[PDB]
Amino acid sequence: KNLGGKSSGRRQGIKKMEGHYVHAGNIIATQRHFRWHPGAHVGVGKNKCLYALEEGIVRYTKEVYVPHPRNTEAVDLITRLPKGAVLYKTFVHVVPAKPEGTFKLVAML
Amino acid sequence: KNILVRMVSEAGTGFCFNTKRNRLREKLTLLHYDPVVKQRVLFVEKKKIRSL
Amino acid sequence: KFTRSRIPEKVFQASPEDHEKYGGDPQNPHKLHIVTRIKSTRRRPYWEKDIIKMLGLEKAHTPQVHKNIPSVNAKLKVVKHLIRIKPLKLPQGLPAEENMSNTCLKSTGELVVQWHLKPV
Amino acid sequence: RRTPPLGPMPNSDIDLSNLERLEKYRSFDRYRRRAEQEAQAPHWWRTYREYFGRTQQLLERKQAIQELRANVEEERAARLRTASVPLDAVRAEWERTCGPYHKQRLAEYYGLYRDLFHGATFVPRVPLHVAYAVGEDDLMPVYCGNEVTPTEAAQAPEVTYEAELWTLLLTSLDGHLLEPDAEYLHWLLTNIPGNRVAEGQVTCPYLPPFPARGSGIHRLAFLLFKQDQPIDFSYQLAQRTFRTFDFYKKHQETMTPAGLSFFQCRWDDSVTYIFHQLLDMREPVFEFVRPPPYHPKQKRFPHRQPLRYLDRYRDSHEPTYGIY
Amino acid sequence: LTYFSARKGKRKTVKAVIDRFLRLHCGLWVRRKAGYKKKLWKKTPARKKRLREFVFCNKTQSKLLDKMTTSFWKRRNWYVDDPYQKYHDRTNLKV
Amino acid sequence: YKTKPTHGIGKYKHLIKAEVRAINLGTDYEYGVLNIHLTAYDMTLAESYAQYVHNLCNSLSIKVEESYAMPTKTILTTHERVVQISGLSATFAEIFLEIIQSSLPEGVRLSVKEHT
RNA sequence: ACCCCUAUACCUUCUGAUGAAUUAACUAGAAAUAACUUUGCAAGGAGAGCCAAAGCUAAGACCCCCGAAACCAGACGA
RNA sequence: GCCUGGUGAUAGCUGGUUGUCCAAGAUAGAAUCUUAGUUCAACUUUAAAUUUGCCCACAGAACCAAAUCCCCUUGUAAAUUUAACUGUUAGUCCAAAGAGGAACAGCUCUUUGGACACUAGGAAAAAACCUUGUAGAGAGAGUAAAAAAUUUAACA
RNA sequence: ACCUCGGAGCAGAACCCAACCUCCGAGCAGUACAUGCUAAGACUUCACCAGUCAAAGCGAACCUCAAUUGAUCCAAUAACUUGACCAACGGAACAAGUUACCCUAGGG
């Protein structure tokens, strides 16, 4: 009497591991709950998927988690902590490769 | 419980768009956006399309 | 499940007992290995079959020279159960262009650069 | 397969058996404070920072503020929050006391030390004051990092500073057209007696700033040097070019820097006048050119792409006709 | 399909294929997306923007559609004010 | 990641306790849950004194479970406030009770009664 | 010659029962859209029609044998 | 009924498919009135164009075991793309991790890896265990795997 | 008893992984009416079909939930749009029981 459960794998996880060159708009990793958070130059979709906002190299770090004050779930999770207790998460960053443009000589007026 | 109705623009006319609204509440008037006037304009609902 | 096997590093750390057993010096080690396939790649996983093809040991009982560098040592650590390793020792020098043709690698592990066929 | 942590893990020392006996962050703000402190600490894992990075004074000050809070109108005005502050006294006393460290911050933020002296930091002790004449009525002051037009800086400025020799220097850290390293100076007055400027040996006379059109926004350095022993020194832009580092290296024995004031310039019509009139060359015009957009390698069968895909890879928007 | 007709002994086109697809002269078949005019009330505007697109076909879909039409449909067409005419020749491929 | 040295850097549920008799075993002795009833003919002195008790207890690191009030009675009206306390020491029983004794304003009585 | 030693008939169907006494004769891969190879000519090719943004023309090279119960029409039969 | 015709009916089913010699070549799946079948994919094959492929080191991949991904060096020689098509798939057993069953089955269902549907030697015979692979002749030689070991009970 | 979709275990750490295996669920509701238009770059349920994410831009302000669903043709409509418990859920436009009289082609 166990019907259902025939759903397939979502094929989620990391698409660009650390060190990988990444162009703008590449999906870095799709998750189902926030396993990785967006860091520098990384955006988030409605599906909690991390994509890239610049061209560069993906890096994963461990950072202090300080949520938005209007996020009453995580903020209520803060205030229960003891006085030294600091939350960390793993973040994903894109270190941007190129300069965003050069000055070039155009005309000798 | 809900109804899919069409919403006809009052100006820049011939423009419709569909919405959901309850069976029991009143006839919708909205401020949608006409891309023909390219403004926000009152729409009035004219016909229920399908009772979803 | 049968998987690829990591081997810990304590396995590849010699003891002075072993320096008494085999003929090695931890200071000034040897440059070149002689590797020989002495076991089949049949009934072995496909990764070991590949490493045997990379090291150039498709034919058994045929010696091959390698460098004693950590990359080649990593490949050798994968297939160390199929091969035999001895140091290439060189009693005289490495062969010059004069002695290039007249060499012979002996069984001992040494490579002699003058190979007559006369008795001493 | 666990490998043990390299240094201490976070949330280790506070991890006790009795959490309910431990007093907690009652707030959001305290966690933000502690959290920022832990952000600034050096760690052993990979972090964002790796990749993207006397007694009489206290006596007179205590009696001074103690006399300040004693007046009834100060308390009554402050509790009715209609009390204010004279900005001028704060300005001049700021010029006196802790201004030099702040001008040091502004010179470090604007990269005057990494470029002007290869990182040799110093402190501008002298509260220098430079201003350009804006007609006859008013005059545009130069503070550290201001914007001043080259029309305002057409004529050499009035320099006043309270001190007792001196060598004053102006440079343009970025305005060099040919070399990406050197900089054109604008005027270098030396051996200056006291605090009058006119009696200085005008070695290199005054040019206005000339930033080229579209070449962005320029910074212009007023150095002011404590001189000990008066030394002799020494419109062609091959002659206005030098570097302040190895200039100062020749003369650092009996001269130390004592004053900064630097400012920004952009293009203006006066710079048309500078290039054409007195430099006698055509003006260079620059444009900020962004890199071309990445598109992947074009496929034979661009499966499921829209029809726009063929336009990413073409270069003419006109009907080509081929062999016909 | 019919490989040899009974009257002419020629190949025949499948007219479903012509009725749904567009052969560009370079070999690309353009199609419309399935369900682009169904149940639009329950689709997000991103999805509706995706369905109102002219989508190219696969390689094997392309070869399947080539085999199901004839050489009349594979031919240069110099129409007057053709909307798709700038998409026939293939610009700037590096294979 | 499970094999890296920074494994479990992000865990936090051991830092929140997301969840009665007295404990007097052999050496470490403590009262169970208590009740402190405050009855007065004044809302003001009972509420305010309950504040002073409650701020003492927070200022001396005591678990204060509740600080509710009981309904009044038709008599004049008698008001009650119940400020629960759990866990004291031998010395801290004496030192804690002597201040509540020595801080009563006017005619408001006490209770060190326990639960049920 | 045998004795010695070695040696689990063939086809087919399954991951690893079928059919055949034997001989002779008979008995089972049919299509050139597109691609490829080779020529011709070449911004044109083709002996009208057709194709052509190096193409077009020509050739070469690819698609089995036997076997039901049935259904229908018309006859012949007590 | 039987005969002739339609009729070379139709058959996803059974059976059969004829010279030589060489080469390359075996186990993911998804849909389906579908599980005796097809279509797409995966794998396979040829031709072509190009440039990397494989092995991999630090670093790196989450909160609520064995390992893998990623990956420069290095060791090697392949890979991807373009063109054109066929064929194959309930695999079996062994080792390992498991599920169902009786911690039965030469039982059923997944995963990782071997081997077998490719050779030879051994294990009694012997698909799947061990040794071993690339092809010929030799009345040469060195080897690999490779032979089951056990025998007991006095008592103050 | 089931047939489609989702979550968890099996399947401990990238992805994938079966069973008439073990347990939960779904076939909506609510809010908004810029839930406008366009468009680089990507992910993808092992094919296809479907699905997802999205910077910049123009125009304006100053969506939650996991699943929450259905192709083509055809209809209806001036148009925009709408149409299945087609749930056997890749869906034939509409077809039940039974044969120890069964029959044929095969398999065990």
Ligand SMILES: [Mg+2]
């Ligand atoms: Mg599942």
Ligand SMILES: [Mg+2]
């Ligand atoms: Mg599945």
Ligand SMILES: [Mg+2]
């Ligand atoms: Mg035969």
Ligand SMILES: [Mg+2]
């Ligand atoms: Mg008769």
Ligand SMILES: [Mg+2]
């Ligand atoms: Mg037949």
Ligand SMILES: [Mg+2]
């Ligand atoms: Mg059939």
Ligand SMILES: [Mg+2]
């Ligand atoms: Mg072969």
Ligand SMILES: [Mg+2]
């Ligand atoms: Mg069907």
Ligand SMILES: [Mg+2]
């Ligand atoms: Mg079938």
Ligand SMILES: [Mg+2]
């Ligand atoms: Mg690489």
Ligand SMILES: [Mg+2]
């Ligand atoms: Mg896929």
Ligand SMILES: [Mg+2]
């Ligand atoms: Mg069905």
Ligand SMILES: [Mg+2]
């Ligand atoms: Mg179905």
